[PDB]
Amino acid sequence: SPSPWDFLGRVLQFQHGDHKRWWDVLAPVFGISMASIGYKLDVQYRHLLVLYDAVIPNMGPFPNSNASNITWTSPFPPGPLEASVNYQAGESSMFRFTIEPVGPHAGTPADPVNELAAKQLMQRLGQLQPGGVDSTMFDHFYPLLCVDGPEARRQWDSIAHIYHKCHTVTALDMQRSAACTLKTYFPPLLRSTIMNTSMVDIMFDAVESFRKQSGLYFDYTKIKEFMSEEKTHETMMVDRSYLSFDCLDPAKSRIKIYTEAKVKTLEEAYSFWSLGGRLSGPEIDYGFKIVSQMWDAIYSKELPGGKQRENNHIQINWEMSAKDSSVAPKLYLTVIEDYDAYVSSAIVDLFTGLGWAAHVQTHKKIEKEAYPMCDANPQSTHAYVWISLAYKKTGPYITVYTNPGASILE
Amino acid sequence: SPSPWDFLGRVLQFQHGDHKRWWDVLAPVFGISMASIGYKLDVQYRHLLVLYDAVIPNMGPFPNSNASNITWTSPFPPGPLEASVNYQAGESSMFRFTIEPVGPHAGTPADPVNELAAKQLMQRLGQLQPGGVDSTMFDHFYPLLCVDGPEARRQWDSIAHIYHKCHTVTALDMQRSAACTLKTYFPPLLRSTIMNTSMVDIMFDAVESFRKQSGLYFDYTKIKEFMSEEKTHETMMVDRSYLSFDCLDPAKSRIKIYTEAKVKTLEEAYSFWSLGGRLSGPEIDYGFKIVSQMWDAIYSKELPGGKQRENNHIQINWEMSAKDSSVAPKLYLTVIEDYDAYVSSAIVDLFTGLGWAAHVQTHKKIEKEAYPMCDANPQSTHAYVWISLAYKKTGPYITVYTNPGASILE
Amino acid sequence: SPSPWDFLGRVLQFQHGDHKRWWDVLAPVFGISMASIGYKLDVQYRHLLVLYDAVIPNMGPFPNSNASNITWTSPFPPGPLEASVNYQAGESSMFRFTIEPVGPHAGTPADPVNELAAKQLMQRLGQLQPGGVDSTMFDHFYPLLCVDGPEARRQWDSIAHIYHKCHTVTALDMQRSAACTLKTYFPPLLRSTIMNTSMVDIMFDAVESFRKQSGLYFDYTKIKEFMSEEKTHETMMVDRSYLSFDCLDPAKSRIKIYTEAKVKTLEEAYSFWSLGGRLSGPEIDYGFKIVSQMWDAIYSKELPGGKQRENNHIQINWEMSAKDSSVAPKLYLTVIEDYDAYVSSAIVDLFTGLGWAAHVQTHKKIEKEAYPMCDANPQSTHAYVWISLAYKKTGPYITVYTNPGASILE
Amino acid sequence: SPSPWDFLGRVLQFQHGDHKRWWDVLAPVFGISMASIGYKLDVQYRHLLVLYDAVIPNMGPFPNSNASNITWTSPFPPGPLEASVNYQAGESSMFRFTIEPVGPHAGTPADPVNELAAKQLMQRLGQLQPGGVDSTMFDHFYPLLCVDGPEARRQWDSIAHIYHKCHTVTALDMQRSAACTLKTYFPPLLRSTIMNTSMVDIMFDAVESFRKQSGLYFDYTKIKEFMSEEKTHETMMVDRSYLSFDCLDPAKSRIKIYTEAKVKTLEEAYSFWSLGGRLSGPEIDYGFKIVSQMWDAIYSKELPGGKQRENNHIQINWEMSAKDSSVAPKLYLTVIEDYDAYVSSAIVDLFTGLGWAAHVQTHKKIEKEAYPMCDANPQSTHAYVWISLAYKKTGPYITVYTNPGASILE
Ligand SMILES: CC(C)[C@@H]1NC(=O)[C@H](Cc2c[nH]cn2)NC1=O
Ligand SMILES: CC(C)[C@@H]1NC(=O)[C@H](Cc2c[nH]cn2)NC1=O
Ligand SMILES: CC(C)[C@@H]1NC(=O)[C@H](Cc2c[nH]cn2)NC1=O
Ligand SMILES: CC(C)[C@@H]1NC(=O)[C@H](Cc2c[nH]cn2)NC1=O
Ligand SMILES: CC(C)=CCSP(=O)(O)OP(=O)(O)O
Ligand SMILES: CC(C)=CCSP(=O)(O)OP(=O)(O)O
Ligand SMILES: CC(C)=CCSP(=O)(O)OP(=O)(O)O
Ligand SMILES: CC(C)=CCSP(=O)(O)OP(=O)(O)O
């Protein structure tokens, strides 16, 4: 019995060779992950056809040997920023993946700001599931945080120095229902650089305007307070922050404020995890015990090439609920330049301690089948990229983010 | 939840508009049938993608208003000759469909004999399922019964008078396993017209040569005897005969000899059903009781336009087993020019008498969902085309053949 | 020797059947026009491939029998708003065509404002000719006059009453050089309806801001004066006005202000042609003599169905030069609901009087070859749509606009 | 002004990525050659679209790094066997190219004999030019010399030892008229290996049968006599012989018998060039003086890697005219494993001696623009493959055959 991705690659007609190459790289990874976590074959077919129809045509050029064709500059290797599996209690596992929608002529004089690809992906996905994409939050936040083509082209001298001219990132939560929840991330770096306004101010002003004109509670007081301090700016790269929302009914959606911090201790990490004691409770302590566990387990081990850990790179989101005044943190450990073996051992020890044996086996199956380089090459550095840790009232919430184009780098 | 054909038509990229139009006509029919008989969604996706990849590109031009584009002449309306559901005991139901593979330029000076389309379909299907298409029987019977392009073009003056220059028909048994069994039919009319040899002789000589060079028992004595008589030729249109084989291991395949007969009584029908008393047993009597039942039930009712039944059009196959000397008949009643309502009532009465209530509901569901014209238009004549009746040792074996392009004629 | 459109339709691979159908309708028309006016075969191939690559994929659904698939409402029949041939002295003839870029899912919940198609066309055309599309004027005028998707979706209640939610129209001057000059038209009806500001004010404020931030002279004083009067509004449908610019270096581009007027006399027509005596000179008088000639020649003749001419429908542009303070008028007579025979006779008499015999034969050749319905059907009403008249210092400037999808309406 | 291949690659939609890659390799070469020899842009577009539509889809997989995807074995690198420019007197230059039509699944269990691709190419080309492909000669010679799929699959044990299971090669003479003359080559190695008959016998029996059933004179007496001798077989690899015909009206076509010979002297070369003194006259002597000139000029120079010339590899055709009893030779020197610089110097010296300065500059332009590796790499071995020499009554006839996929090997 062939697998959905094999059979589909056999039958599917592709509009461009780059789509076929992206397919050959990614469809096995995504399918193996969905299968290992237990998605039904109906659902695998539907999600792989979403990937074929809506995502891959908006993924951009497929890298050649010298990457002479990647005209859209990025610190991230071409392709999805990540494919992720989130593990919770009750053997709950969801597949997700993030893409910075890149057009095929982005970075060229015709699309110097990559303005259409996210919109094309939105449109195609909405056609594939009418009623699955609500553009209310997108329509409010796009003018404020995002920069259109015209504005970016008039104000080019202001932003040409920026290496990654990203303005919209799109993630798909590929649900076990064959439903794909779209999530939009806006890095407002271009907005700030053109308006010479601060990230904090534009983001939270957009949030407050949405509050006003929607009647929904998105409490950002604590986040703004913490993020405007100077002790935070000492470690924070606030220019690396972004705003995320689920593209749904604003009453069922969220707002999330992301920022990057290069820290050295778990005190500086608790600083971001609790916004300076402003957030407290049992969930905070449980989540930070998980954080310290994975910190000691991953960042204690040595790096490749005997390189020293100058500091530890973390990202952080604070999630604001449209129903309540409840800021909840999610801490991302960056592990892209660590040993995939040590990362996997840390994940396995964590799951084992939490009683998640099924998740251990799912993670190992995904590693073995979809990321063979982890065992073939003992000095593997390309598969795993991020570990997200959170503690909801449901329990722990651990997302493992991997590079599904590691094949390309090995 | 969308259906596989809806979602696929949304996502699938088609190489030609005619493929898209054929899809819009046929995918709902085929999917509704597969669903009603209980095929899993995995299997529906796989079979609809076979239809999209291998079949529809070899179905030919999609008819316009005036059919100015159907350059390949045929008595059958463009598209599949039939989509069929076979019903047996134990609530067993299989979906099948028959296509005369027509190229897009067949009947034009470039492909005046339609030589490649069957081969293209064979190749594509074999790629989609390596090991599912055995070409042994095809390779033996193609030179004998079929005519290649070169031979047909040198000997054109001999066959240009033929209206339907068909040489290969291909049917797919779309199994509940998502496996597609390919069956090949060869009408040797062109072979006979060029060699001015008799159909009987070329067909049974090919059968005997396969016997010799394979060591398999295909007893054609009784069939040859019956079909060479003159009383048979009085009713038989032997020039309408053809040879069918399943494209599998010859030891697991069959050979089937088909012929057309326009008869007037059930005595002349028993003549073909038993080869003149040569075939006998309980299966023969049971099957012919079913035949008489459906005869009285369908051909007694009046025709549209008050037209009189000059005679009754039947086809007949005799199936020879590669294991035994066991000729088994299958009798086809032609109902294309009858009332679909009376045909459906006959089918329902038959199933009810046999104790097949699930099959009654499956047939009615397929009629309602995939052939709405049967209820919308009380004078419906386009959906149902054939009723095949047989009695295997397993029990009755009744196949309902419908025109899945009835949409086009209504 | 086949023609470029025949051979290309034979070889070209189309992404969608609608593109193939649009091709079958339009490529003969466009090719016949380009050929009749004398474009080299190299140029015909290049322009037809532009049409195949950039235009037709952004033309929208191809109308079926009942037009059940045209979800984007418009008073204009689906397809190009016009294909035009402009005739000047010296046997100068240029081919042009106008398209309202419509996406394939425009008017549906996924693209309710048709936001991407014009941008996709711009991008594709810029890729096909890097340096041929300057977005400076587009980037300045798009935020002001045009409405993005987000704004249109937040402010939907304000504009849902509008039947034609058009915001960007794109014309291509297909030059004899195989260069395609892109021209962008913005109808600011949505901008005005959302901001409840007047068309005059938003348009001329955008023009003045471009003046300021570009240092180019675009004198709109006379146009604003005339268009804000009340006597003008008595006849003018100012809500039908739009702003056009050539997508080039603003110093080599133009600005043009278009408005519709349903008038009854040539006094009311001179009112628009001279902005109320504000524009004067020999060019004005010559051009208006041509206007009166064609008025008497076309609108004197009777209509089909014996319907009476309630009034005469004209459009008008005033062209402002980036170099000088020189407003120049161009008057459009609407002839869509006249007899194509009388329109053609008027055109021929005009050309003959002007000494344009080559143009007479070019026009008759285009009528005969690309619009046969004009002779086949004596009561032809679908081919010709507009006659534009102007008198530049070079001489007369007469553009004949035709519906290149008349095939679809006959 | 872009070139036809650049613009077309920009606009053309490709059915498969391999077609796009083959295009990127070959369209510049073919276009540069056609342009350098003076084909009009109309003609370049038409021929490149033939290449895009009919040829490249039947060229087969595009080789990856390790050629893991070339499942169809061949001594020749994947792609065209050659692109050629023929030079004659009067500054006459014609572009040609040869392809062994390979399907995309040839060499796999579904197409183990590559049976359809030549037929698909024939059909597509005939559609692109109805009346340009006459299948009379093809229809007569295909059953005799070529092996169909069924025969090759029944008789597999007889031919599986053959490395190159080629049966049909197709060349296109891309005329300055934008007309493409198709030429078919049949290597009957499979026919002989299955029938265990000699190449000579099957080929000349097919020729004699065509004579009989056509009334055309194809004198093969001298060729048969020479090729059946034993002294010839001492040097001749008769199993490497093939039969060529132009796919036209047999009265305007030719028959050509090709064979390979690895010789050591020009006496052994004259043996093939004159069939052992059987062919004589001034043309023979002139052509062989040209042959000796190029022999001394090319095979005297040393090889790369200091490897010794064991012997010199030549091919030879004898052309029989459907009008006369006139066998004419054409001698092919193999130069694939020589220095491209010495080959080019020999060609240039030859042309110069013949007074062909325009041809010298055309050849140098093609080398510089389409084969830059010849100057970039002084040790170039991949561009030039063959030099054909003949002396018709018109004068010399020198064809330079190059590998248009040298890019892939450098
Ligand atoms: C790409 C963009 C500039 C911005 N920056 C980031 O670092 C993260 C990337 C990421 C994916 N999964 C975990 N982290 N997301 C973003 O949207
Ligand atoms: C089409 C061909 C000439 C030949 N003739 C026929 O009548 C039947 C058609 C058929 C399909 N299902 C039931 N009957 N089959 C054949 O192969
Ligand atoms: C379509 C749009 C609303 C707007 N309105 C019009 O009437 C004209 C149409 C037109 C095409 N060629 C001559 N006249 N142009 C426009 O841009
Ligand atoms: C490929 C086939 C087996 C056979 N063998 C050959 O050697 C030549 C190849 C060739 C191309 N141009 C000059 N020589 N042609 C053929 O048809
Ligand atoms: C996805 C990129 C753009 C940032 C990392 S965050 P993630 O959101 O994918 O995880 P969650 O939705 O918060 O569950
Ligand atoms: C299918 C056409 C060509 C003839 C009617 S016969 P059928 O074979 O489809 O039915 P069976 O295989 O005999 O079961
Ligand atoms: C083209 C539509 C949108 C309006 C009619 S005006 P036209 O501009 O095509 O003619 P000109 O450029 O003014 O020459
Ligand atoms: C072309 C391959 C198959 C063999 C070399 S011969 P060529 O025929 O291309 O040259 P001519 O037609 O003889 O002019």
Looking only at the bridges linking them, the beta strands covering A312-321 and A169-174 are: unpaired
- Roughly what angle, to the nearest 10 degrees, separates helices A282-298 and A266-273? 140
What are phi and psi for residue C215, nearest 5 degrees? 75, 25
What are phi and psi for residue D126, nearest 5 degrees? -65, -35
The verdict on a CB contact (< 8 Å) between B7 and A46 is yes
Looking only at the bridges linking them, the beta strands covering C180-186 and C169-174 are: antiparallel
Domain limits, chain D: 4-409
Closest of C351, C362, C356 to residue C387, by C-alpha: C351
C-alpha dist (Å) from residue B142 to A12, B206, B224, B243, D123 = 30, 10, 21, 11, 21
Helix (H) or strand (E) holding D257: strand D254-263
Amino acid at D221: T
Closest of C222, C199, C400, C232 to residue C328, by C-alpha: C222
Closest of A99, A176, A27 to residue A401, by C-alpha: A99
Radius of gyration of chain A (CA): 20
Contact D55, D332 (CB under 8 A): no
Interface contact C281, partner A, CB < 8 A: no
Dist CA B385 CA B371 (whole Å):
13
Which two three-digit tokens encode residue D299?
């095979």
Looking only at the bridges linking them, the beta strands covering D384-392 and D328-334 are: antiparallel
Question: Phi-psi category of B393—alpha, beta or left, where left has phi over 0 and alpha has psi -120 to 50?
Answer: alpha
Chains touching chain C at 3 or more Cβ pairs under 8 angstroms?
A, B, D
Amino acid at A407: S
Dist CA A175 CA A78 (whole Å):
25
Dist CA D268 CA C257 (whole Å):
84
Contact A192, A205 (CB under 8 A): no
Contact A105, C53 (CB under 8 A): no
| Method used experimentally | cryo-EM
- Residues written for chain C: 410
Contact D107, D72 (CB under 8 A): yes
Which two three-digit tokens encode residue D173?
């003479």
Contact C193, C162 (CB under 8 A): yes
Q: Nearest-5° angle of CA A96, CA A99, CA A102?
A: 160
Chain C residues in contact with B17 (beta carbon < 8 A) = 14, 16-18, 20-21
Which two three-digit tokens encode residue B65?
């208003």
Alpha carbon of D36: minimum distance to chain C alpha carbons (Å): 17
- Residues written for chain A: 410
Token match 């010849």: residue? D374
Contact A70, A78 (CB under 8 A): yes
Ligand 4 centre and the CA of D72: distance in Å?
16
Which two three-digit tokens encode residue B177?
């396993």
Amino acid at A30: F
What are phi and psi for residue C355, nearest 5 degrees? 85, 20
Contact B258, B245 (CB under 8 A): no
- Residues written for chain B: 410
Dist CA A319 CA A143 (whole Å):
22
Distance of CA D147 to the CA centre of its chain: 20
B7 burial type by CB count under 10 A (0-12 exposed, 13-18 middle, 19+ buried): buried
Dist CA C11 CA C8 (whole Å):
5
Dist CA C57 CA C125 (whole Å):
12
Nearest residue (by CA) to ligand 1, atom 10, is A81
Contact B400, B387 (CB under 8 A): yes
For residue B58, what is the DSSP state?
G
**What one-character-per-residue DSSP string does C8-60 give?**
HHHH---SSHHHHHHHHHHHHHHHHHHHHHT--HHHHHHHHHHIIIIIGGGT-
Helix (H) or strand (E) holding C409: helix C406-409
- CB C338 near ligand 3, within 6 Å: no
- Roughly what angle, to the nearest 10 degrees, separates helices D117-128 and C4-11? 160
Distance of CA A332 to the CA centre of its chain: 10
What are phi and psi for residue B38, nearest 5 degrees? 105, 25
Question: Which runs of consecutive H residues, i.e. helices, occur in D103-174?
Answer: 117-128, 136-145, 149-154, 156-159
**What one-character-per-residue DSSP string does B260-308 give?**
EEEESSHHHHHHHHTTTTTS-SHHHHHHHHHHHHHHHHHTSSPPGGG--
3-state secondary structure of A68: coil
Dist CA B120 CA B110 (whole Å):
16
Per-residue burial over C142-181, b if 16 or more Cβ lie within 10 Å, else e, is: bbbbbbbbbbbbbbeeebeeeeebbbbbbbbbbebebebb
Which two three-digit tokens encode residue D169?
């090669």
Q: Which ligand lies nearest the alpha carbon of B254? A: 6
C323 burial type by CB count under 10 A (0-12 exposed, 13-18 middle, 19+ buried): exposed
- Dihedral over alpha carbons B13, B14, B17, B22 (to 10 degrees): -110
For residue B41, what is the DSSP state?
H
Dist CA B40 CA B48 (whole Å):
12
Diameter over CA atoms, chain D: 60
Dist CA C7 CA C1 (whole Å):
9
What are phi and psi for residue B81, nearest 5 degrees? -65, -30
Number of H helices, E strands in chain D: 17, 10
Radius of gyration of chain D (CA): 20
Ligand 2 centre and the CA of B81: distance in Å?
7
The separation between the first and the last C-alpha atoms of chain B, rounded to the nearest angstrom, is 29
Give residues with Cβ within 8 angstroms of B182, minimum separation 6: B122, B125, B132, B133, B170, B171, B172, B246, B247
**What one-character-per-residue DSSP string does A301-335 give?**
SPPGGG---S-EEEEEEEEEESSSS--EEEEEEE-
Residue C247 bridge partners (DSSP): none
C400 burial type by CB count under 10 A (0-12 exposed, 13-18 middle, 19+ buried): buried
Dist CA C183 CA C321 (whole Å):
15
Amino acid at A272: F
Amino acid at D407: S
Give residues with Cβ within 8 angstroms of A46, minimum separation 6: A178, B7
C-alpha dist (Å) from residue D21 to A79, D17, D235, D383 = 21, 6, 40, 19
3-state secondary structure of B1: coil
Dist CA B206 CA C115 (whole Å):
65
Contact D408, D62 (CB under 8 A): no
Dist CA C140 CA C207 (whole Å):
9
- Roughly what angle, to the nearest 10 degrees, separates helices C41-50 and C17-37? 150
Distance of CA B293 to the CA centre of its chain: 22
Which two three-digit tokens encode residue C228?
């804000």
- Roughly what angle, to the nearest 10 degrees, separates helices B282-298 and B266-273? 140
Number of H helices, E strands in chain B: 17, 10
Dist CA D389 CA D371 (whole Å):
22
Residue of C nearest to B20 (CA): C17
Diameter over CA atoms, chain B: 60
Dist CA B159 CA A244 (whole Å):
71
CB atoms within 10 A of CB C1: 10
- CB D401 near ligand 4, within 6 Å: yes
On the CB side of B121, how many CA atoms lie within 13 Å of its CA? 30
Dist CA B364 CA B340 (whole Å):
12
Dist CA A104 CA D257 (whole Å):
50
- Residues written for chain D: 410
Long-range contacts of A202-210 (CB under 8 A, 24+ apart): A202/A144, A202/A145, A203/A145, A203/A241, A203/A243, A203/A257, A205/A144, A206/A140, A206/A141, A206/A144, A206/A145, A206/A243, A207/A243, A207/A255, A207/A320, A209/A140, A209/A144, A210/A137, A210/A140, A210/A141, A210/A250, A210/A255
Which two three-digit tokens encode residue D119?
């037929």
For residue D109, what is the DSSP state?
T
Closest of C315, C320, C343 to residue C330, by C-alpha: C315
C-alpha dist (Å) from residue C63 to B23, C15, C59, C102, C126 = 19, 17, 11, 13, 28
Dist CA B401 CA B332 (whole Å):
10
Token match 């285009």: residue? C366
Tell me the residue ranges of DSSP E strands in C89-179.
Answer: 93-99, 169-174
3-state secondary structure of D72: coil
Question: Phi-psi category of A115—alpha, beta or left, where left has phi over 0 and alpha has psi -120 to 50?
Answer: alpha
Interface contact A17, partner C, CB < 8 A: no
Helix (H) or strand (E) holding D22: helix D17-37
Dist CA B313 CA B327 (whole Å):
22
Looking only at the bridges linking them, the beta strands covering B169-174 and B93-99 are: antiparallel
Helix (H) or strand (E) holding B237: strand B236-246
Q: Resolution to 1 decimal, in Å?
A: 2.5
C-alpha dist (Å) from residue C259 to C197, C207, C311 = 17, 16, 16
Per-residue burial over C51-79, b if 16 or more Cβ lie within 10 Å, else e, is: bbbbbbbbbbbbbeeeeeebbbebeebbb
Tell me the residue ranges of DSSP E strands in C275-383.
Answer: 312-321, 328-334
Residues within 6 Å of ligand 5 by CB:
A 84, 96, 98, 169, 171, 185, 330, 388, 399
Question: Phi-psi category of A140—alpha, beta or left, where left has phi over 0 and alpha has psi -120 to 50?
Answer: alpha
Closest of D46, D1, D2, D55 to residue D26, by C-alpha: D55
Contact D374, D344 (CB under 8 A): yes
On the CB side of D156, how many CA atoms lie within 13 Å of its CA? 12
Ligand 7 centre and the CA of C166: distance in Å?
16
Contact C402, C81 (CB under 8 A): no
For residue C310, what is the DSSP state?
S
- Roughly what angle, to the nearest 10 degrees, separates helices B41-50 and A4-11? 20
- Roughly what angle, to the nearest 10 degrees, separates helices A41-50 and A4-11? 50
What are phi and psi for residue B89, nearest 5 degrees? -75, 170
Please report the sign of the dihedral spanned by the C-alpha atoms of residue B65, residue B68, residue B71, residue B76: positive
Give residues with Cβ within 8 angstroms of D88, minimum separation 6: D392, D394, D395, D396, D397, D398
Among the partner residues C1, C11, C42, nearest to D53 by beta-carbon distance = C11
Contact D194, D151 (CB under 8 A): yes
Q: Nearest-5° angle of CA D56, CA D62, CA D63?
A: 150
Closest of B84, B59, B96 to residue B74, by C-alpha: B59
Residue B172 bridge partners (DSSP): B97, B182
Nearest residue (by CA) to ligand 8, atom 1, is D98
- Roughly what angle, to the nearest 10 degrees, separates helices D41-50 and D17-37? 150
What are phi and psi for residue C338, nearest 5 degrees? -110, 175
Distance of CA D380 to the CA centre of its chain: 22
Q: Nearest-5° angle of CA D219, CA D225, CA D227?
A: 105
Give residues with Cβ within 8 angstroms of C2, minimum separation 6: C10
Looking only at the bridges linking them, the beta strands covering D93-99 and D82-87 are: antiparallel
The verdict on a CB contact (< 8 Å) between D13 and A15 is yes
Closest of D143, D235, D243 to residue D194, by C-alpha: D143
Token match 């030719």: residue? D254
On the CB side of C402, how many CA atoms lie within 13 Å of its CA? 29
On the CB side of D2, how many CA atoms lie within 13 Å of its CA? 20
Testing ligand 2's pocket by substitution, the residue of B73, B96, B98 carrying the most ligand atoms inside 8 A of its CB is B98
Interface contact A217, partner B, CB < 8 A: no
3-state secondary structure of A228: helix
What are phi and psi for residue A153, nearest 5 degrees? -85, -30
Which two three-digit tokens encode residue D98?
């040869």
